[PDB]
């Protein structure tokens, strides 16, 4: 019923996914992002906590709750801008260690809650890059908003998705939910940067393919398939085939790069215990690539082939 991709990791879901949905819905209601039974029932039809349950298939308790809550908040925040600077600047302001969320919009109170939970156990090294990545994702909403008012090239679109999209924050989140911070000496290596970049783009473009009908029905031009078609004057099948080749190349690059990590850690003198943190984050990336694919394929959010 949907485009199928060869993602070479098993399908996995956290065993506590069902209870996780109940807890996540209760959070969305407590934060004022879901109001009323009708909206809750519509929201649950998306399996909205199941994307976190697939990414974070062994997390428990508050770690699992955080992972699930991030995605639900994203749907509410993302869909808010399908409908600015003052608003987004308030979201960014919630990253400040001394931020006071009192009186802010519910989306920004919820973000403050997420960030406090996400950042508290992580190092200053992680927090610096996590603040940068959050800021880039949040402030980007102004670039999508201008495209809509005043279509990008293939190259520009790809740059905007991977430099300023939601994957840079989600990659940082993997380290938090798995409680596995990537050692700073290996984080900046070409190998780990390639793994981060390929995870980012694979997930972006798998989502573009599998959410295409929804975005077309809404008139959202921000989709690689539509961008390719406009730039190249190509058919729908041609552009889908181009996206497919790109997805396959990123998957291949990921799985060809991972085997280099143990020897790289040896050259950098990384203690074995710290290597296991890296290997755990890389497993989190595998689970993210596969979980994104399985969730985008199954979710009613993408019916086109509102709870707010």
Ligand X SMILES: CC[N+](C)(C)CCCS(=O)(=O)[O-]
Ligand Y SMILES: CCC(CO)(CO)CO
* 150, burial (CB in 10 Å: exposed 0-12, middle 13-18, buried 19+): exposed
Q: Is 301 annotated as a binding residue?
A: yes
Considering only residues 64, 114, 247, 264, which one is a binding residue for ligand X as defined by CB under 6 A? 64
Residues 103-122 within binding reach of ligand Y (CB under 6 A): none
Contact between 206 and ligand Y by CB under 6 A: the answer reads: no
**What whole-number distance in Å separates Cα of residue 60 and Cα of residue 16?**
8
**What whole-number distance in Å separates Cα of residue 147 and Cα of residue 144?**
5
Contact between 15 and ligand X by CB under 6 A: the answer reads: yes
Contact between 43 and ligand 0FV by CB under 6 A: the answer reads: no
CB of 67 to ligand X, least distance (A): 11
Query: Binds 11, which of its own copies, Mg ion, ligand Y, none (CB < 5 to 8 A, cut-off by type)?
Result: its own copies
Are 50 and 13 a contacting pair, CB within 8 Å? yes
Q: Is 302 annotated as a binding residue?
A: yes
Contact between 11 and its own copies by CB under 8 A: the answer reads: yes
Contact between 252 and Mg ion by CB under 5 A: the answer reads: no
Are 147 and 141 a contacting pair, CB within 8 Å? no
Q: Judged by CB, which is closer to its own copies: 208, or 274? A: 274
Residues 2-21 within binding reach of ligand Y (CB under 6 A): 3
Q: What is the length of the chain?
A: 308
What is the residue whose two structure tokens read 């430099």?
163
Q: Is 211 annotated as a binding residue?
A: yes
**What whole-number distance in Å separates Cα of residue 137 and Cα of residue 143?**
10
Per-residue binding letters, 135-174, with its own copies (x by CB under 8 A): ----------------------------------------
Considering only residues 78, 100, 249, 252, which one is a binding residue for Mg ion as defined by CB under 5 A? 78
Contact between 204 and ligand 0FV by CB under 6 A: the answer reads: yes
Contact between 226 and ligand 0FV by CB under 6 A: the answer reads: no
Contact between 204 and Mg ion by CB under 5 A: the answer reads: no
Are 68 and 49 a contacting pair, CB within 8 Å? yes
Contact between 203 and ligand 0FV by CB under 6 A: the answer reads: yes
Are 2 and 297 a contacting pair, CB within 8 Å? yes
Site stretch for ligand Y (CB under 6 A), options 62-70, 198-206, 239-247, 272-280: 239-247
Can you tell me whether residue 121 is helix, strand or coil? coil
CB of 27 to ligand X, least distance (A): 14
**What whole-number distance in Å separates Cα of residue 282 and Cα of residue 199?**
10
* 16, burial (CB in 10 Å: exposed 0-12, middle 13-18, buried 19+): middle
**What is the 3-class SS of 18-86, one letter each residue?**
HHHHHHHHHHHHHCCCCCCHHHHHHHHCCCCCHHHHHHCCCCCHHHHHHHHHHHHHHHHHHHHCCCCHH
Residues that bind ligand 0FV (CB under 6 A): 51, 71, 74, 78, 166-167, 170, 203-204, 207, 211, 292, 295-296
Pick out the residues of the known binding site. Answer: 78, 161, 207, 211, 214-215, 301-302
Residues that bind ligand X (CB under 6 A): 15-16, 19, 60-61, 64
Residues that bind ligand Y (CB under 6 A): 3, 237, 240-241, 244
Pick out the residues of the known binding site for substrate. Answer: 161, 214, 301-302
Pick out the residues of the known binding site for Mg(2+). Answer: 78, 207, 211, 215
């Amino acid at each position: 019923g949907h485009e199928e991709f060869d993602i070479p990791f098993p399908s996995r879901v956290n065993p506590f996914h069902a209870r996780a949905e109940d807890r996540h819905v209760a959070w969305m209601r407590a934060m004022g992002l879901i109001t009323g039974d009708a909206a809750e029932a519509t929201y649950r039809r998306w399996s909205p906590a199941k994307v976190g349950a697939r990414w974070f298939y062994l997390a428990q308790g508050e770690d699992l709750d955080l992972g699930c809550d991030i995605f639900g908040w994203f749907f509410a925040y993302d869909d808010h801008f399908d409908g600015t600077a003052a608003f987004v600047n308030r979201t960014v302001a919630m990253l400040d260690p001394r931020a006071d969320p009192t009186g802010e919009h519910p989306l920004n109170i919820a973000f403050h809650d997420l960030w406090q939970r996400e950042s508290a156990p992580m190092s200053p090294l992680w927090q610096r890059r996590a603040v940068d990545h959050w800021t880039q994702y949040l402030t980007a909403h102004i670039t999508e908003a201008t495209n809509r008012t005043r279509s990008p090239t293939i190259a520009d679109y790809l740059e905007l998705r991977h430099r300023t999209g939601f994957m840079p924050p989600l990659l940082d989140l993997i380290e938090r939910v798995w409680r596995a911070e990537i050692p700073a000496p290996v984080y900046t290596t070409p190998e780990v940067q390639t793994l981060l970049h390929t995870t980012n783009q694979n997930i972006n473009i798998v989502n573009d393919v599998l959410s295409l009908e929804k975005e077309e029905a809404h008139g959202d031009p921000h989709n690689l398939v539509l961008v390719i078609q406009h730039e190249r004057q190509s058919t729908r099948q041609q552009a889908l085939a181009t996206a497919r080749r790109m997805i396959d190349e990123w998957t291949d690059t990921f799985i060809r790069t991972e085997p280099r990590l143990p020897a790289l850690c040896g050259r950098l003198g990384i203690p074995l215990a710290d290597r296991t943190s890296l290997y755990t984050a890389v497993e989190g990336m595998r689970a993210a690539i596969r979980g994104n694919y399985d969730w985008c394929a199954e979710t009613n959010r993408y019916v086109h082939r509102t709870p707010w």
